[PDB]
Design a protein around this ligand. Structure first.
Ligand SMILES: Nc1ccccc1Nc1ccccn1
Ligand SMILES: [Cl-]
Ligand SMILES: [Cl-]
Ligand SMILES: [Cl-]
Ligand SMILES: [Cl-]
Ligand SMILES: [Mn+2]
Length: 340
């Protein structure tokens, strides 16, 4: 039976089922006021699927110059053509190779660059912005988006959206690396999975993906979305409450010191964007500091709502295209104020 919502993370995460329902705010706003993330499924069914394919991005934009990041070691690959990234998205035998001769796991850095998404891709911009869930919060002019209404005493988000494109992490060693390291934003964000690419050439890679989700602490209902409904999983997220950010900074100062980093006692390991919390570090955070997070698997068409101030990290299971929009809800406006 079609239902308004369900729960993940053993009751700790709201999952809304219908992305465009005018009644969603009534369920959403109580969870949001408490500083919880929220998942909305089914956004892919609202979009024009032909606009969100890796082959179309290569054909239309392939001659642009870009930088890539090697996710395994954080090395920058400078001034290559964007087709060198897109043509290897799903076909492993076409990927740029490291010196060891392996195909690299790559992230496309800042593309489209800065605020240029709308100018470069006007049909994509329209398709995304018209189908975002919770539109009074997420649209540039929504009644509960304060972004366009605040004075300079508040940090205002840039004009979006922003596109986040990266290969899937593959090996047992890759389980300890992030696609995007632990960081926080002073604005709220909605992040939509518009495409998941399951590769070929080393296709048969299904078992390291299950072990990553299991060791990632994903709940039993999340696991049933794969085995029972055959949905395509894109990325594993860990999100922490804004109120736990300083305890996470204390853990990462102690670990920085154990590993022989030499940091001033006030330095900010979350702002540095240099850490990925692996199974060892997540268990340490829980046992030693009393901090629990939310382990979230984002499937094709899932929109993840990330509260302002909430530390979070992302680990791609397969090749992903994500599009995100920042906004300023009244619930969380304290996080972007420049005083006290
Ligand atoms: N998605 C949703 C959200 C809030 C309120 C109602 C719905 N819709 C619905 C449709 C059939 C049966 C029961 N609920
Ligand atoms: Cl808050
Ligand atoms: Cl376009
Ligand atoms: Cl709304
Ligand atoms: Cl990062
Ligand atoms: Mn972020």
């Amino acid at each position: 039976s079609m239902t308004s919502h369900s729960w993940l993370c053993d009751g700790r995460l709201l999952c809304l089922h219908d992305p465009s329902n005018k009644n969603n705010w009534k369920i959403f706003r109580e969870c949001w006021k408490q500083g919880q993330p929220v998942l909305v499924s089914g956004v892919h069914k609202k979009l024009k699927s032909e606009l969100w394919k890796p082959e179309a991005f290569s054909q239309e934009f392939g001659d642009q110059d870009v930088d890539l990041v090697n996710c395994r070691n954080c090395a920058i690959i400078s001034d290559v053509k964007v087709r060198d990234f897109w043509d290897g998205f799903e076909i492993i035998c076409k990927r740029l190779r490291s010196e060891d001769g392996q195909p690299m796991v790559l992230k496309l850095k800042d593309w489209p660059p800065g605020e240029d998404f709308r100018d470069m891709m006007p049909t994509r911009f329209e398709d995304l912005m018209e189908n975002l869930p919770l539109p009074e919060y997420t649209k540039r002019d929504g009644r509960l988006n304060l972004a366009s209404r605040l004075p300079s005493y508040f940090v205002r988000p840039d004009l979006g959206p922003k596109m986040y494109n990266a290969y899937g992490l593959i090996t047992a060693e890759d389980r300890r690396v992030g696609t995007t390291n632990l960081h926080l934003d002073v604005s709220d964000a909605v992040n939509v999975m518009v495409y998941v690419g399951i590769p070929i050439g080393e296709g048969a890679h299904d078992e390291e993906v299950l072990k990553t989700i299991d060791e990632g602490d994903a709940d039993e209902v999340t696991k049933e979305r794969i085995h029972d409904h055959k949905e395509k999983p894109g990325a594993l997220w860990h999100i922490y409450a804004a109120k736990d950010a300083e305890k996470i900074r204390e853990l990462l100062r102690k670990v920085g010191e154990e590993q022989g980093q030499e940091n001033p006692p006030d330095h900010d390991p979350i702002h540095d964007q240099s850490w990925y919390l692996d199974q060892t570090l997540r268990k340490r955070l829980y046992e030693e500091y009393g901090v629990q997070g939310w382990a979230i698997v984002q499937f094709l068409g899932d929109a993840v709502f990330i509260p302002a101030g909430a530390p979070h990290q992302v680990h791609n299971l397969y090749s992903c295209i994500k599009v995100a929009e920042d906004f300023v809800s009244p619930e969380h406006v304290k996080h972007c104020f420049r005083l006290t």
